[PDB]
Amino acid sequence: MISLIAALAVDRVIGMENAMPWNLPADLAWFKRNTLDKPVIMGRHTWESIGRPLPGRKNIILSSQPGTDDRVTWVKSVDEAIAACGDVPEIMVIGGGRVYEQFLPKAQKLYLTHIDAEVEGDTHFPDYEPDDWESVFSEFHDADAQNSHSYCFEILERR
Ligand SMILES: CN(Cc1cnc2nc(N)nc(N)c2n1)c1ccc(C(=O)N[C@@H](CCC(=O)O)C(=O)O)cc1
């Protein structure tokens, strides 16, 4: 099935090719933990932000333009993206905003990071009626020396 994993700031602002706009260390850790050994689908920008292949995962870049790195898979359509995933049990969609929007309706799970931070940006995570999902895990964390904002991890399953 397909899952989306995203970092969200107040009002759902995301940094589309960034996360919940920023790059909280604790969040990147959670992100690795939950995407390792699974294929990850991302748009060009996010790839660019990342700058290298994410190790331990099959990197699939969804983009209309030709690739520039033979170490990852370049695809030009959601159909191709999925096929390249083969028959794994879970596909992780990592953003940005446009890719979230194309995959959200097909998704069955959401791995979210709620960061208590006001940030301005024009991009937000797509809307999802909270009444259609079910929270199965939550873990709140206060701001620390490493993470300047508090954040809360949450996993939801489509009901
Ligand atoms: C820009 N970006 C996209 C990004 C960032 N945070 C996210 N955070 C969440 N929760 N969800 C996303 N989809 C997400 N995407 C990045 C940037 C760096 C790395 C990265 O280096 N992660 C290493 C983790 C290494 C480390 O802990 O620094 C990895 O092995 O996954 C991943 C995604």
Spatial separation of the C-alpha atoms in residues 70 and 48, rounded to whole Å:
15
Q: What is the largest CA-CA distance in the chain?
A: 43
Q: Write the DSSP string, 42-67.
A: EEHHHHHHH-SPPTTSEEEEE-SSPP
Closest by alpha carbon to 69, among 50, 97, 94? Answer: 50
Category of 127 on φ-ψ map: left (φ > 0), alpha (ψ -120 to 50) or beta: beta
| Number of domains into which the chain is organized | 1
Alpha helices in 74-147 (DSSP H): 78-83, 97-103
Shortest-distance atom of ligand 1 to CA 29: 27
Spatial separation of the C-alpha atoms in residues 99 and 119, rounded to whole Å:
21
Query: Using CA positions, which residue lies closest to atom 18 of ligand 1?
Result: 50
14: domain CATH number? 3.40.430.10
Residue type, 127: D
Domain carrying residue 51 = 1-159
Shortest-distance atom of ligand 1 to CA 42: 13
CA of 92 to the centre of ligand 1 (A): 12
Q: Is 82 in the pocket of ligand 1 (CB under 6 A)?
A: no
Name residues whose C-beta falls within 8 Å of residue 59's C-beta, 6 or more positions apart in sequence.
Answer: 39, 40, 42, 47, 53, 71, 72, 73
Spatial separation of the C-alpha atoms in residues 35 and 85, rounded to whole Å:
14
Spatial separation of the C-alpha atoms in residues 112 and 27, rounded to whole Å:
10
Q: Is 14 in the pocket of ligand 1 (CB under 6 A)?
A: no
Helix/strand/coil for 30: helix
Q: Is the dihedral of CA 118, 43, 30, 91 positive or negative?
A: positive
Q: What angle do CA 72, 79, 91 make, to 5 degrees?
A: 60
Q: Is 24 in the pocket of ligand 1 (CB under 6 A)?
A: no
Q: What do you get for the CA distance between the two ends of the chain, in Å?
A: 14
CA of 106 to the centre of ligand 1 (A): 22
Residue type, 8: L
Experiment used for this model: X-ray
* Contact between 19 and 7 (Cβ < 8 Å): yes
Query: Omega into 96 within 30° of 0, i.e. cis?
Result: yes
Q: Is 31 in the pocket of ligand 1 (CB under 6 A)?
A: yes
State CA 11 to chain mean position distance.
Answer: 17
Burial-class residue 22 by CB neighbours within 10 Å (0-12, 13-18, 19+): middle
Q: Is 102 in the pocket of ligand 1 (CB under 6 A)?
A: no
